Design a binder for this molecule. Structure first.
Ligand SMILES: Cc1cc2nc3c(=O)[nH]c(=O)nc-3n(C[C@H](O)[C@H](O)[C@H](O)COP(=O)(O)OP(=O)(O)OC[C@H]3O[C@@H](n4cnc5c(N)ncnc54)[C@H](O)[C@@H]3O)c2cc1C
Ligand SMILES: Cc1cc2nc3c(=O)[nH]c(=O)nc-3n(C[C@H](O)[C@H](O)[C@H](O)COP(=O)(O)OP(=O)(O)OC[C@H]3O[C@@H](n4cnc5c(N)ncnc54)[C@H](O)[C@@H]3O)c2cc1C
Ligand SMILES: NC(=O)c1ccc[n+]([C@@H]2O[C@H](COP(=O)([O-])OP(=O)(O)OC[C@H]3O[C@@H](n4cnc5c(N)ncnc54)[C@H](OP(=O)(O)O)[C@@H]3O)[C@@H](O)[C@H]2O)c1
Ligand SMILES: NC(=O)c1ccc[n+]([C@@H]2O[C@H](COP(=O)([O-])OP(=O)(O)OC[C@H]3O[C@@H](n4cnc5c(N)ncnc54)[C@H](OP(=O)(O)O)[C@@H]3O)[C@@H](O)[C@H]2O)c1
Ligand code: NA
Lengths: 315, 319
């Protein structure tokens, strides 16, 4: 039972929904596939303060529910599925889902990015039993208990700041001695450090995630300059070492650059066009530099307008 | 006041109070760049000349362009952006701090984000120039109230002309939509709404027509002479106001000879490796419709405004 769409959008983050809204207003009758994280990465943050025009109190989940209802306002067909294989070698394009299969005349890819892991066997062993990559999902378990966050970028800082309202102590662990985040969040971070609420463990790498048959009980860390080992007692570990683009299913199907989908870019339009004619990409899956909801939504709009111009040219 | 007190220095200066400029201010303020934003003469930008906006993602109920832009203003002020009411009439980008000269005061800055957008074009006729402010307008929300229950004309065939015709269709007695082709290029949902109004007779289509002259008396417009594009048959139309909606041109006259331009748009690096809003002058960035001749949406302008703030932060940090 192959479901055919004129325009198929993969992803229910801000790029996917913005593409759907524009495509629906162009009378393209878009079909949007949600994926397994409906709403996208913003559903794993708490307050969003830099969505322009939301100056009061907006949560990531609240914003993405608005975008869902916006796409539905213009009758976007929203389908739950997870695409596990694509074949772009001929048209119409073929996509293979956990629930059903699809074909389409134009494809907008907005599959975003997902958290990476450090790769230790002990880390794997405790995934979903005290090792997590989503602070808002699992933070409540650690009310008044010690937790760890590993990483030094804008995700690690946001997760440490979120957990600082919940945990007794947040141990923020990084293999360098400085952090990279919006400066307003660096300011908040160091205030919590001066209050003793966040404890910094700089120039440290994870050596082993420790625990028992229930869950995590601590970490062994290694000094990046001496090799010297140390142990830390804690109840949960949040791995925040970066989100890599969700493009495994496009290996061998599209031009990628370090996993990001290569698009035309440029100043002459058709800027979201991939290496395959009729396939476009928007949002974090093609952006390794800005990584914002607002920039993802902007390229989502561009992909819809690019896809409209392409379908118009097919007669 | 003296020449020294008229020179405000900003670490980062943003020109324009449309969605590109305000989004840049929000990000720049959160990057501790203490931004100063110069509003220009159209505070809030082009969206203050439209009524409802239906494609700002996440605004699914009833939002107007002016409502959204007032929100963005308050958002920039939340992070303590300094908002300055001025219009820049000249710049010198040859030295750092960059020098800008305003109608009200002068400025210097360590980095500059240009988000000056675009303004409505006029056809270029003497009769059209003669009746500006006397019945010739390029802003339907500004002036439409004065034509309640009177006939009006809109000229143009694109998204702006259709949206302005749809707006005036609720105010004028009749809207005459005039265009030099038989076809209109706008969002297909808007085209559907246009033809519902045409079929209701509230909008009357004048296809294959060009403006030959704008007619009036000592006090203001009284009609138009149109020319058939096919034959050349001239004809006259009685109406009280004309809204010219033939597109917008990027506001870059003050950057001529200062930045690389292409058909008046500011050329930026673009690309996929960051620093995408950098102009030909190091430390100067451009965002929004002033650099985008292809998409021209609020959401795309806001996205590039964010990029310009992040690029300017990376530039200032490196100094
Ligand atoms: C903790 C955290 C905090 C953040 N805070 C902010 C903030 O304050 N401000 C801000 O601007 N940005 C913030 N961001 C970044 C922002 O969330 C992203 O830039 C944005 O969500 C990117 O949107 P996107 O649509 O490109 O992708 P995503 O939001 O990642 O959405 C991808 C979508 O694709 C779907 N998908 C993935 N793989 C498949 C598949 N195989 N088949 C089908 N569907 C698939 C997913 O289910 C998801 O719905 C934050 C990110 C994180 C992780
Ligand atoms: C009638 C109409 C309807 C529209 N409807 C929609 C819609 O429904 N959805 C949508 O997404 N988009 C819509 N748009 C387009 C949208 O308004 C623009 O894409 C967007 O406003 C561009 O933002 P910007 O910040 O780049 O420029 P602008 O909004 O043009 O802002 C430019 C700013 O720069 C300032 N400025 C200019 N020159 C100077 C100077 N010399 N010194 C200082 N400041 C200066 C101006 O005062 C202004 O504040 C519409 C446009 C029009 C005209
Ligand atoms: O952000 P992003 O998605 O664009 O990617 P990213 O910047 O490469 O990663 C974000 C943060 O996580 C750290 N990190 C990445 N991989 C790591 C690992 N394997 N072990 C420990 N820390 C790691 C990075 O440190 P580095 O800056 O040291 O990579 C950086 O502070
Ligand atoms: O945005 P943008 O600036 O790129 O808008 P645009 O798409 O160039 O213009 C929008 C509409 O205005 C018409 N137009 C432009 N200049 C005109 C003129 N001098 N006289 C009469 N009609 C004119 C165009 O007609 P065409 O479709 O004939 O260009 C088009 O349908
Ligand atoms: Na409202």
């Amino acid at each position: 039972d192959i479901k055919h769409a004129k325009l198929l959008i993969l992803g229910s983050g801000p790029a996917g929904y913005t593409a759907a809204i524009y495509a629906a207003r162009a009378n393209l009758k878009p079909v949007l596939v949600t994926g397994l994280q409906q709403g996208g990465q913003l559903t794993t943050t708490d307050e969003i303060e830099n969505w322009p025009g939301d100056f009061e109190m907006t949560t990531g989940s609240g914003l993405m529910q608005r975008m869902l209802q916006h796409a539905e306002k213009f009758e976007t067909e929203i389908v739950f599925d997870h695409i596990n294989r694509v074949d772009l070698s001929s048209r119409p394009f073929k996509l293979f889902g956990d629930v059903q299969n699809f074909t389409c005349d134009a494809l907008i890819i907005a599959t975003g990015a997902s958290a990476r892991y450090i790769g230790l066997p002990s880390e794997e062993n405790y995934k979903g039993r005290g090792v997590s990559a989503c602070a808002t999902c699992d933070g409540f378990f650690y009310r008044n208990k010690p937790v760890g966050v590993i990483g030094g970028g804008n995700t690690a800082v946001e997760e440490a700041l979120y957990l600082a309202n919940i945990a007794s102590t947040v141990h923020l662990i990084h293999r360098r001695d400085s952090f990279r985040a919006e400066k307003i969040l660096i300011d908040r971070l160091y205030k919590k450090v001066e209050e003793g609420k966040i404890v910094l463990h700089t120039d440290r790498t994870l050596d082993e995630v420790l625990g028992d048959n229930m869950g995590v009980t601590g970490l062994r860390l290694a000094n990046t300059k001496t090799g010297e080992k140390e142990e830390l007692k804690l109840d949960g570990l949040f791995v925040a070492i970066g989100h890599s683009p969700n493009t495994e299913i496009f290996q061998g199907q599209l031009e990628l650059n370090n996993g990001y989908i290569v698009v035309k870019s440029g100043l002459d339009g058709n800027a979201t066009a991939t290496s395959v004619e009729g396939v476009f990409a928007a949002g974090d899956v093609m952006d390794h530099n800005y990584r914002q909801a607002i920039t993802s939504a902007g390229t989502g709009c561009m992909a819809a307008l690019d896809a409209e111009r392409y379908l118009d040219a097919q007669e």
